[PDB]
Amino acid sequence: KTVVVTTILESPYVMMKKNHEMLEGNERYEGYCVDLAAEIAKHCGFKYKLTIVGDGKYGARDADTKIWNGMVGELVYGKADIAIAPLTITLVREEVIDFSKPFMSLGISIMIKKVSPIESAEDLSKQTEIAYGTLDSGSTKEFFRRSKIAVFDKMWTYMRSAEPSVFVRTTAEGVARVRKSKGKYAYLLESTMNEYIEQRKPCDTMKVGGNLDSKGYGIATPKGSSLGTPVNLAVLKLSEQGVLDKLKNKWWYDKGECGA
Amino acid sequence: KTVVVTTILESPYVMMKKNHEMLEGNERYEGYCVDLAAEIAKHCGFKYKLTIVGDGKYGARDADTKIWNGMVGELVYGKADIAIAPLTITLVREEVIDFSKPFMSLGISIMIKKPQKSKPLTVERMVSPIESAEDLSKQTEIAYGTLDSGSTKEFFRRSKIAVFDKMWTYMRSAEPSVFVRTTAEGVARVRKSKGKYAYLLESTMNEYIEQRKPCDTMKVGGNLDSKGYGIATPKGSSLGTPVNLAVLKLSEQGVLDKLKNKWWYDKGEC
Amino acid sequence: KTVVVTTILESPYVMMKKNHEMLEGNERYEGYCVDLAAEIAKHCGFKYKLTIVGDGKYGARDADTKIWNGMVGELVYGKADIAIAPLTITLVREEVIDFSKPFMSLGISIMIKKPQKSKPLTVERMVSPIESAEDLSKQTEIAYGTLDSGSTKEFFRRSKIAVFDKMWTYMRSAEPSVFVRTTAEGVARVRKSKGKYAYLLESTMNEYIEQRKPCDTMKVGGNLDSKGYGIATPKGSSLGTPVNLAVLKLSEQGVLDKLKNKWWYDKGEC
Amino acid sequence: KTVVVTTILESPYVMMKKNHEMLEGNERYEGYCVDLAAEIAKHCGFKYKLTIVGDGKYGARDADTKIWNGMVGELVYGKADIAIAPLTITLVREEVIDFSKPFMSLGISIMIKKVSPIESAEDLSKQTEIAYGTLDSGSTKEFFRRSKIAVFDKMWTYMRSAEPSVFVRTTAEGVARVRKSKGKYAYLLESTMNEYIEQRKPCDTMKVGGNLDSKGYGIATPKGSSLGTPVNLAVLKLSEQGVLDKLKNKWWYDKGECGA
């Protein structure tokens, strides 16, 4: 009985190698999440199959319908057994799926094309000359929707009432938008992906400010599943012997195809 | 019914008030941990009384007769219901108790007494004889110590990394023992050692001591490992889900961030 | 029963929202004044309807055919119940309506176009032809005027001081139509006058226009006097005491200061 | 029937004349408040007698007793008819006495001896080596006690718990304590008296930071008294014709025994 694993096409977590057209099975995928899934299977001792989520959405619940899309929907509705992917641990998602202990710390950061006048987030909210956006159906957008800090509510009020839409469909599309905006558009994304982008050639984007908050990535399992304890123990073990640190160093700093 | 909550006197997590001789109940203690417990009670209503573990240890797997001591030992054997205190999440601990989601990020850091400023146009510069863990392990002129019955000692004991293994090998044979009973003893040793002692401790406490007078000690390098603090609860308890949900609610509400800002950086004496 | 609340369209006190076409009720208007009305309704429970007076005037009294116009006229003759708007407290108005305690300080000032940077070691300095009110009265190469049917004209008309009386005499002697119907018209006259006109207005609006693009005007000198903005109710009304108490409570609670900061200094530029 | 006017001994509002031993009656008093009372009587048309408050307190309500002392006590208990004195208009005082329109704006300031490390109030609250105190039985003390702002709350916690008594009995005692503390003490007092002190020789004190809030001095009358409207319109008249400004300039800047 193989285990269906739901992932997303996001770098450096999952890459579609370079010759996927002439490869079969999981051998056509590479990345941090593929290595993490391999280690999880090695510790637990189960066969796994890598399946991409049908819709390129991390997961959210749409109001007035009460339905889930993406990996979270693929988990609550029994379409997959485990989600080794950069899924943010949030209060809403925990009520419907089980989150393991975080395996990668993260924070909300602001990145712009290459002293930067943006500086911190409050100045970005005050300065309306330069626009800022957020990935569609992500934890950042839901974080800003339910935020209560006055500055964060100002940012949310600006984003929900803007023309055209400041939101972006995919992270790569947001990177392209910020690169092609000549410093007129800003992107709010996770610290890990932003760092990976800023350490990659041509290196036309940089991180500004600090981290708005602190979150984490966890291995997701369906509610009431028997895999929660083994995957939690495996994540704890990997953190104890630093396999996660080695994987992050390999996939974030070993290549270093940038000037730094 | 009022449950038993256990804490340990570590500043700024749990500190005794100046006017505490006559006060009774939960009003005796003040700190970050008591505020976290108050917010936990506000989210899910329950009655709690602040207690301190008898031997004042975080909890370690004692060898030989296989006995758990300190906070974890109290939690396991039914004398405790929940521990709201800076207890790091550990695989060994996770196999023995249940841990909530990390409410505080942490890492192993290195402490050293701040050297005197170098005189050499006329600008003044600081020279750090210690920079990283590899250089600290390579040298022998400066001894280094850890906390007795602490998760840092467990991490060093079974670390496959060559530098960490060499460090632990030095620790086990070093005489007199560099291990200290309380973090206060370690900070005192660092202060009185004239710079000949490096006491490894969690990044949060190191930053707290740095921000506070007499601010004669400094934190060197980056975090060797990345870990977190979790609210402990005995296995097979119905209270784990409410505390996990309350921690998630507090983290998403920004209460934890403002509490950390007000307890670690608002009281900056240097 | 819903009472009538009359206001005046002055930024940032009362400005229509961009998407006001497809909205009805009080949701169309936004600014400092609507927030003050919301706090007033929160303190004392009542329903209010936001209305704009037909002639769009603050209030003045004719001498030959005595009649009160604008907001004060609306309040006196029973057409309105309360005016939560920047109405200056005046002795003449106090004899025809009831003013609560002031909720914002103010002062008569002078507006002038911002001069160009002076190139002539290499520094840039701001030099203005006007330094205070006395020089403006003494000089005759820059014309000045106030707002039509307002409190500033009333103050200048019956001022015994030599400088202000002389200014009023020139206001009757220059003989253009130096009095402007709206504050926006006077600001536009100052901006497009290339440096030939000075506008007298309240310090609050002066600062608001100063901190907003294209910011081609400066605040010169200091306030010629001190006045305030009060919530006005008709004489003999039972609502004067509740609104007075609500304003006092808001002032003690710091809500007024936070609204002033968020509507005057948190939206600035250049 | 002469009208009893309750005043307090506080400069420059009311000064006890140096020749008062040979001066009998209302002639023995001079100051801003004496001139204001003279103008009020000139407008309204009543005979006035200035009587100092028995106990040098502006006014407050005792906790667990519910009694009023000082000017407010002298007003609500029928001891005096009008209070022409620097009485701060506050929320709780208005419920028991009638306040007129303010005749002088004011704010909460900071007093220290002559780099200015303290600067603003938040930095004053951050630092502990230097202590700050206010005057008991006054608007500032009640405002600090009843303030709900976190920074003001921590200031109140500091002053309410300090040994010895950080509070002061009189404004002159406060400025003397500031002068003799060699910069180790801070006084939070009304901005008007702060300016008067800082412009008076030997000029060893100066104002730092900005005003924490905005209040006003008003003429006080007993609840239900008939003097409300006459004194209110008199204050409005005086403020409109600038006599109030002239008196302020005379009693604060005309002498100028300092260099500025």
Ligand SMILES: NS(=O)(=O)c1cc2c(cc1Cl)N[C@H]([C@H]1C[C@H]3C=C[C@@H]1C3)NS2(=O)=O
């Ligand atoms: N350095 S990092 O961001 O790749 C990173 C971040 C984290 C790691 C491990 C690594 Cl390598 N483990 C912790 C978990 C492990 C065990 C101890 C704390 C939680 C449970 N979560 S974390 O603090 O989010």
Ligand SMILES: NS(=O)(=O)c1cc2c(cc1Cl)N[C@H]([C@H]1C[C@H]3C=C[C@@H]1C3)NS2(=O)=O
């Ligand atoms: N800034 S901090 O170290 O006090 C801190 C650290 C952390 C916080 C919140 C704060 Cl304020 N919440 C996260 C939690 C939120 C959700 C994602 C990871 C856990 C579950 N853990 S954390 O990354 O260990």
Ligand SMILES: NS(=O)(=O)c1cc2c(cc1Cl)N[C@H]([C@H]1C[C@H]3C=C[C@@H]1C3)NS2(=O)=O
């Ligand atoms: N800073 S400001 O001009 O917006 C401002 C000005 C004033 C405020 C409050 C604010 Cl926020 N309250 C006072 C009121 C409070 C009590 C004392 C005077 C009146 C009654 N009036 S004020 O001195 O005219």
Ligand SMILES: NS(=O)(=O)c1cc2c(cc1Cl)N[C@H]([C@H]1C[C@H]3C=C[C@@H]1C3)NS2(=O)=O
């Ligand atoms: N220049 S000053 O501080 O002596 C001063 C301050 C003030 C004065 C008059 C003077 Cl001279 N009058 C106003 C009053 C007049 C009318 C408008 C606001 C109140 C009612 N209060 S005030 O803004 O507190």
Ligand SMILES: N[C@@H](CCC(=O)O)C(=O)O
């Ligand atoms: N990976 C995040 C989305 C990234 C973002 O917030 O922009 C999530 O699973 O919610």
Ligand SMILES: N[C@@H](CCC(=O)O)C(=O)O
């Ligand atoms: N926080 C650690 C103790 C500190 C240390 O070991 O350095 C624990 O809970 O075990």
Ligand SMILES: N[C@@H](CCC(=O)O)C(=O)O
């Ligand atoms: N605020 C003034 C009008 C503005 C002005 O005259 O400059 C009033 O209420 O009369």
Ligand SMILES: N[C@@H](CCC(=O)O)C(=O)O
């Ligand atoms: N004059 C003030 C007291 C001065 C102070 O606040 O220190 C009052 O009447 O309340």
